[PDB]
Amino acid sequence: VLYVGSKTKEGVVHGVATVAEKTKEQVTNVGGAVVTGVTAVAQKTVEGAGSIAAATGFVKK
Amino acid sequence: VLYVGSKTKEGVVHGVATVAEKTKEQVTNVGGAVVTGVTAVAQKTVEGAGSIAAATGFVKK
Amino acid sequence: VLYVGSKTKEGVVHGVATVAEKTKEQVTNVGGAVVTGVTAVAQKTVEGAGSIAAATGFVKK
Amino acid sequence: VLYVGSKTKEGVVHGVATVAEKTKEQVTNVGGAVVTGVTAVAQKTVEGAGSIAAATGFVKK
Amino acid sequence: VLYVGSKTKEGVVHGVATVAEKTKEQVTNVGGAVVTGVTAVAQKTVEGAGSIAAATGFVKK
Amino acid sequence: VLYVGSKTKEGVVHGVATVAEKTKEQVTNVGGAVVTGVTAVAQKTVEGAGSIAAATGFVKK
Ligand SMILES: CNc1ccc(-c2nc3ccc(O)cc3s2)cc1
Ligand SMILES: CNc1ccc(-c2nc3ccc(O)cc3s2)cc1
């Protein structure tokens, strides 16, 4: 009943240096799902299902 | 009943330096889902399902 | 009953330097969904489903 | 007698991403020379003495 | 007599990502020479003495 | 007499990622020479004395 947050950090990314020399990149998706190339990403959920880089499947019923 | 937030951080990205030399990039999607190239992204949800870079599937019923 | 926020940050992006030298970029979508090239994006939801870069599927019923 | 330059590069800087978060910077020079903070600099000399960031001395005769 | 340069590179810097989080920087020079903080610098000399970041001395005669 | 350079590289720096978290930096020079903090530097000399980060001495005569 006296919660005290201070200087806290949650789902935090900082201080990222990145060099990506690539002569070629290619995704050839044929009918499917694909996720590629996530970098320096931060989420924070409450009462929820939190996905960052999901390759979810073809739901059939 | 005396919640105190201070200097808190949640779903936070900061201080990102990025160099991307690429002679070619290509996504050849044929009928499918694709997500590519997410960088320095921040979310924060409450009472919700939070996805960042999802490749969700073809819902069929 | 005495909530106190101060200097808080939520879904925040700051201090991003980005160089992207690319001789060619190409998305050849044929009938599908595609999301590409998200950079320095910030969201904040309450009582809602928050997606950032979703490749959602062809809902059929 | 048939010199051929092509796509050459000399004294060249390119593709530099830089983030500099600093809460304080200070140079307190008292009577002296100082050089600070050179970034992404390019020179090219011919028949000459080329200095980039020199702290040269008090010439006395 | 048939010199052929092609795609050559000389004194070249490229593709540098740098993050510098510093709570304090300070140079307290008292009567002397100082050089600090050179980053991503490129020179090219011909028939000359080339210095990049010299701390040269007090010439006396 | 048929010199052929091609795709050569000389005094070349490339593809450098650097993160420098420092709570304090300080140079307290009292009457002397100092060189500090050289990063990603490239030189190329011909018929000359080439110094990069010299701490040269007090020439007296
Ligand atoms: C399950 N994760 C979760 C996170 C956070 C919470 C709550 N945060 C607050 C803030 C103020 C207030 O008057 C009521 C509430 S309830 C509840 C659940
Ligand atoms: C000692 N380092 C050195 C480097 C280079 C050279 C020369 N480069 C060229 C280019 C063209 C030309 O007609 C004459 C010359 S001489 C000489 C000496």
Swiss-Prot record, chains A, B, C, D, E, F:
Tissues in which the protein is found: Highly expressed in presynaptic terminals in the central nervous system. Expressed principally in brain.
Any one Gene Ontology BP term: response to interleukin-1
Chief place where the protein resides: cytoplasm
Residue stretches of each Sequence repeat: 6-20, 21-31
GO molecular function: actin binding; alpha-tubulin binding; beta-tubulin binding; calcium ion binding; copper ion binding; cuprous ion binding; cysteine-type endopeptidase inhibitor activity; dynein complex binding
Positions with a binding annotation for Cu cation: H14
Phosphoserine: residues carrying this PTM: S51
Any coiled-coil regions, as ranges: none
Keywords tagged on the record: Acetylation, Alzheimer disease, Amyloid, Cell projection, Copper, Cytoplasm, Disease variant, Membrane, Metal-binding, Neurodegeneration, Nucleus, Parkinson disease, Parkinsonism, Phosphoprotein, Repeat, Secreted, Synapse, Ubl conjugation
One Gene Ontology CC term in the entry: inclusion body
Posttranslational modification: Phosphorylated, predominantly on serine residues. Phosphorylation by CK1 appears to occur on residues distinct from the residue phosphorylated by other kinases. Hallmark lesions of neurodegenerative synucleinopathies contain alpha-synuclein that is modified by nitration of tyrosine residues and possibly by dityrosine cross-linking to generated stable oligomers.
Cell location: Cytoplasm; Membrane; Nucleus; Synapse
Region of interest (4 X 11 AA tandem repeats of [EGS]-K-T-K-[EQ]-[GQ]-V-X(4)), residue spans: 1-31
Outcome of substituting H14A: Impairs copper-binding
Record-stated family: Belongs to the synuclein family.
Cited function: Neuronal protein that plays several roles in synaptic activity such as regulation of synaptic vesicle trafficking and subsequent neurotransmitter release. Participates as a monomer in synaptic vesicle exocytosis by enhancing vesicle priming, fusion and dilation of exocytotic fusion pores. Mechanistically, acts by increasing local Ca(2+) release from microdomains which is essential for the enhancement of ATP-induced exocytosis.
Quaternary assembly: Soluble monomer. Homotetramer. A dynamic intracellular population of tetramers and monomers coexists normally and the tetramer plays an essential role in maintaining homeostasis. Interacts with UCHL1. Interacts with phospholipase D and histones. Interacts (via N-terminus) with synphilin-1/SNCAIP; this interaction promotes formation of SNCA inclusions in the cytoplasm. Interacts with CALM1. Interacts with STXBP1; this interaction controls SNCA self-replicating aggregation. Interacts with SNARE components VAMP2 and SNAP25; these interactions allows SNARE complex assembly and integrity.
Disease: Genetic alterations of SNCA resulting in aberrant polymerization into fibrils, are associated with several neurodegenerative diseases (synucleinopathies). SNCA fibrillar aggregates represent the major non A-beta component of Alzheimer disease amyloid plaque, and a major component of Lewy body inclusions. They are also found within Lewy body (LB)-like intraneuronal inclusions, glial inclusions and axonal spheroids in neurodegeneration with brain iron accumulation type 1.
Domain notes: The 'non A-beta component of Alzheimer disease amyloid plaque' domain (NAC domain) is involved in fibrils formation. The middle hydrophobic region forms the core of the filaments. The C-terminus may regulate aggregation and determine the diameter of the filaments.
Protein name: Alpha-synuclein
Species per Swiss-Prot/TrEMBL record: Homo sapiens
Source taxonomy: Eukaryota, Metazoa, Chordata, Craniata, Vertebrata
Gene: SNCA
Section of the entire sequence shown: 37 to 97 of 140
